[model samples]
Target: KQLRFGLFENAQTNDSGTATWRHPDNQRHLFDTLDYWRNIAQICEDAGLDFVFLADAWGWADVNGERPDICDVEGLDLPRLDPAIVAAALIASTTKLGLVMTGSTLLEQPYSFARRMASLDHLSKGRIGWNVVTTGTAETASAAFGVPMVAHDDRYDMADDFMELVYKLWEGAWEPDALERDKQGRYADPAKVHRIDHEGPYFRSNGYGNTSYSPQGTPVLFQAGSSERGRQFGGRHGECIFLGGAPIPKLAEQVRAIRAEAVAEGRAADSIKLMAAFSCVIAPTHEEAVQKYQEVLDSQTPEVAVASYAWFTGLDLSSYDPSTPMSELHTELSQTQVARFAGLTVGDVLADWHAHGVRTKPVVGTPEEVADAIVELAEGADLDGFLLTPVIQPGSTIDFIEHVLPILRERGVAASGYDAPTLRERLLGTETPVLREDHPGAGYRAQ
Candidate 1:
């Protein structure tokens, strides 16, 4: 009943996944436009969304076939902006809406990454969530991190240590009263500040956090990985889990698995909340709605969908044959977008697209139809809410807030009013700027 909904910032562009569209005339200007985000934020606020969750990538997209490079049409393109930068600007523009930014743990040193997140949390008045990622693709990763790509599970290994180092900086390194701005007694009390002095196998920290807690201690943690190592890491860190599925038991198993890992990491089994990918096609009337959705769906070029799949998952569709059995596509599926895809195969993505068809089940139809599926997914999967991926630019997200949110509010499944001032408070129901007792980061919180 306290579940809070949110919008994902990754635009539903020309390339994403199976069953996608790369319309020739579509406006591709959103990547670098601040105005685009500002407008999107205002629309979401009107719908009562807790925040706009931003997804990021460190490398250029992949090229399918012999093109050796890809583009919307010409070639050179604008990638999504650095999310932290966009988040700060959006926070200044909006009074409440939270900003969830994605940053790769594998790419940056903990020292700088910690400070950046802390500063944003403070600037946003404690309304930020960091989506953690271990780099997915290997090509440009070395140039960005100055290190060879570790094996898939090994990256999770580094991420484990990575979380510990940052937690020390954000939660443990400084006393709550570390900063005492007093005109009469000079500046801050230098004695209260502490050093992390962390020396792990993967990373090392010299001392305490220079910055103190913002309105909240640190920002919220919103991880969304699903491999065994990923699930374990997410169970321990992801306060909000981003999962995708149409079947109930599949997602339910995912939630339980993470809860179990939370227990292992000494976190409350129920502390981690699960969120799934959602999309909708809403209109004033059901007939109009179906037509709108059908246009996009029926007009899709199967080759473009396959191209999208290859770029997003590193699966070369040219290397695949549509008639090939799903079993032979295991390696390609393993690295696909939703970790659950690893369970299915190329055939599933190519043939079924969503719902019993591919890796992650995507719901489609009118507001009523979509809302029913969403509510059904929530109840069946034991989910707290969803991290909705828009079907089209701002409009897909705009529609959900306008049409679907009302139905959810009336049904008592969604929030009727804004309860939490910060993203964590809205989701966790606490304004304390620190992780919960069972949370790993709390190990570093000041007394």
Candidate 2:
């Protein structure tokens, strides 16, 4: 419950932007190139890093500037491989690193998603996690589902029911003993198999999944729901609570509230592990760190920032003047796309939404200073470790891993070396890769 670090990849981690002080790290640029991700994945494994997480998105950022189709909205992290295929590729390269892939509950059917994740978990030898999301943008809806996006809150409700169906398939459709070597019998235990008779408002199914239960029973359920509805849903479903905000207190409050909801629902308060959105730019000194931050800023451009925002809000930020009040922005009407998902608008609650959410606080300075800041952050909030965001492409992660990991290990807050058998064991301090009995997915076990 103390801390575990992971890399957030969007294919890139930097953009050519300097104006308005927005545009967080672009991870897509780092890994989406020649042999870029292959070597990066192996390095993370050697460092005893937990997982290389990918954030998947269904639609393109086609709503930027004056034109709805200008690829200007194509910020970093676009032009991506299907995260699962990428994860499988990485898994093939490294034996120990866990791979988390984001997939929308709103778009794909639970059946397809269940089999896909189960297959990956088995292939990775139980090293897989799903970053569960109910995609908030209308641009995503128009293309992924070919349907107008439903009301913001309704999306979470759909996800709630969607999970139940998938859980039945993942945990209950196939018995733990359903698959046997059966070399002499020439078949599996058909009598032990069960079909998931799911009939929910958001989904309906009448057959069993094609595969047996994944070796882990369930691929880890990582969720990033932030709205009240989202939080409530995550309380019941999310094992890894992926959260971001303008500042520390913002993250703390959300963690507290989500755990309280989990408690009220009869689950352990710490059952929901929290991971913050963190970006690091470590150097030999504070001045050098500042220079590194400046390098990112110097390389950044406003058009890029606006394009990134278009992918976020669905309303093109390219049309508005940067100095204009964010409240006047039409996209704020659908806060689900950008607000932390708790029924609050970042523009209304935080003094600077664009800066914190996009530009993000810089973890700069010497290795010791960066280590101290990370320890203090976790110590102060008592939350799980930060989700270290890459500031450049693949190199940002390599540099941080090579340089900063040592001082932190010396300080004794982060793990000095790997002691767990699986990513679940690493994060939870246990050997178990499956969900706890109280977890919502637990009840879905088939046999």
Candidate 3:
């Protein structure tokens, strides 16, 4: 089977960590420019990659109720662009590459978000996807939104309600042939459009969709939520599920568990496409790659890494005693992050974070060796593909495309060209652009 590939990216100066932006080859100085993003999209399109997955969050690094000095000094996840706007800008620059933008259920209103996504899908000619997230920085994000923070599990519950409203808006409001666009007759059939009366626990909507039916009526749903409740939400709604990096055996177990969750939700086990976070440093020789990887490691600042961790999980390592067991620490922020350190001590996690930063363990070697590592993990874990994070902007991506991708393609493990048009059809192998019949959203389609 041909493995899918996507660039795990952010519209910020730094993606993986604060240090990478300082690398001599890094193009982060042009991060705010449309040309830079356009070039990146072109690279992926030319490489026949699956998508450019843009990750976003609203909060900055705040530890112990105060913004850390290094967060600004190191430029960690701040001064970021709205990924949706960036995705929209890239629509005119590339044709084949899918564009996935992150959106938080906690921050957006269903009616408005559905309309925005539908418009983007239309503009992109069905190449748009949504990476759904229930905002992890609950306190800071809530403050930004001027609302009280919803507890982590409860946020997922609220998101389920949010999804139902959007489904009704996207799938239930309009018939497939509603848009007549007839110059000789009425532009649309009034009878074909219906109002979706939704009154969920968290949201309410009573209106017909403002936009016409999109190529993919509901955009391809991508998710990365590893908590127990999060897995359930993903099982029910996610078409492409993103998993954090782990050992092959553990990752394989996660793949099985998530697929089983989908099966229990009345969908096929293969309904969800699993992709794990992957980072790499590749060169012509192992020694060169090792040196490059070491440079990235040496550039990392431990304080920035810990602050970034606190920003995501809302657990300030500085506040906790070093001897505290990881099991004893609790947060309503990211259960997945907490669970990742379950068996270790706070000191151990901090030490690891300090040494390696918060990124996945990179696969550093010659191009052939890198390709071999990817194949082993993909096959062992039953992963459909990978979300590749660049250690340095454009350079890491260029090297992979120039060196590693050829080997994967020659080995018949990577795609040689684009096979499908719409993102949904391309990623899920569905016959059409819309949601599959087995998908929960499909049940809301107009009768």
Candidate 4:
């Protein structure tokens, strides 16, 4: 069986210190332009990558006592355009690549959210996946949505209810053959469309979701939940689970736990594929690769790296002594870093990021070593595949595709061409685009 692959499209594809953002084209500041992402979509498609998952956030950078300033200085979540809106342009630009957009359950209204995704699925011809998240930080909820961030477990609880309504709207509101055209008759079979009268603790939708049924019926569900409660929710709802940068053994444990929970929740153990986040660098030799990587690392400052970390983890490393045990640090926000680097002190976390340029393990060497390292990580952890995130946009991704992918293709681990139609089919290695009968979403299907 081939390993699945997806690109983790960073929200900011730029250098913090440079005006060009280290991009060769001097287009790093073009976040608002569709041409930038269109170029990205074309490149990934040409590389034979399966999908590009856009990681998004509702909140801005809040570190070093900065709100909007850190955003401009660090390019942290300030210049991002609407991911869903971007997906439409990307779909028009490419033919086979899947597009996954992040949508936070905490901020999205169930009715409108369902319709939006449905329309996206239609436009993309089912080449769409939804990365569902209940946002982690509380800093933006009040300002953006006029509500406070719910407790961690409570957020998932509400998301569970939100999914219940979304399922009803997507799966129950429209019949499989609802759209029947006849010039001599009505445009659609009115009798076939039904209202999804859903009333949940967190959402209320009495009318039908007006969006037409897409080729996939619904976008493939993606969740990046690792918490005990979050895992349970993911097991029940997530078709693909996005994991953070945990070590192979730790990642293996997470993979096993999530699969077991999925089986326990009545889904097949293999129903949910695990995609761990990883980074890579490749050159003709190991030394050259190290030098190339070091060049990127040298550009980063301790303040910038730590500020970026704080923005993500919601725990200020500046507040905690660097030598302090990581175990001593606690956060109300659900940051995966604390769990990933549990034994290390806070200083180690900074050190590793400074050294490697990211928290995830990096595969650095020639094409052969890179491919072998990838296989080693995947096989060791029983991971289905990896979401390759970029430390340096275009350059990092281009290097992997140009230099390393050939080795992977020869090894028969990565796809040489797109054979699947929908993102679900691409990831699951099956032609079926709809959620299986065993999935919790199936329960909401129209009788």
What TM-score does candidate 3 get on C-alpha atoms? 0.98
Superposition-based RMSD of candidate 3 using all C-alpha atoms, in angstroms: 1.2
Residues 1-447 of candidate 2 have per-residue lDDT tens digits of 236888887543332111222335444544455377787787788888888888766655555333333233433424556777888788888888888898888787888888888899888888898898877454565555678766666777888888888888888888887777778884678877886697888788998688787767787778875767778888888888887634567666778888888887778987778887677788877898898777666644433444455655666543545445554444422354454434444334233333333435668888778777777667666678767766665556877788887777766766766676566777766567778888888877753
Q: Best lDDT goes to which candidate? A: 3
lDDT of 1 by residue, 93-154 (tens): 88778889888877878889988888988888878888887755444555456777566777
Better of 3 and 4 by lDDT: 3
> Model-by-model lDDT, in order?
0.69, 0.69, 0.87, 0.77
Worst 10 residues of 3 by lDDT: 351-360
Candidate 4 ranges beyond 4 A from true positions: 14-27, 68-71, 352-358
Minimum summed lDDT over a 10-residue window in model 4 is located at 15-24
User: What value does the lDDT take at residue 140 in candidate 2?
Assistant: 62
Question: Clashing residue pairs, candidate 1?
Answer: 172-444, 194-208, 195-207, 195-208, 196-207, 196-208, 217-433
Q: lDDT value for candidate 4?
A: 0.77
For model 2 the local lDDT of residue 166 reads 80
Runs in model 2 lying further than 4 Å from the true structure: 12-30, 64-77, 316-359
lDDT agreement of model 2 with the native: 0.69
TM-score, structure 4 vs. true: 0.93
lDDT over C-alpha atoms for residue 216 of model 2: 79
Of the candidates numbered 2 and 3, which has the greater lDDT value? 3
TM-score against truth, every candidate: 0.89, 0.87, 0.98, 0.93
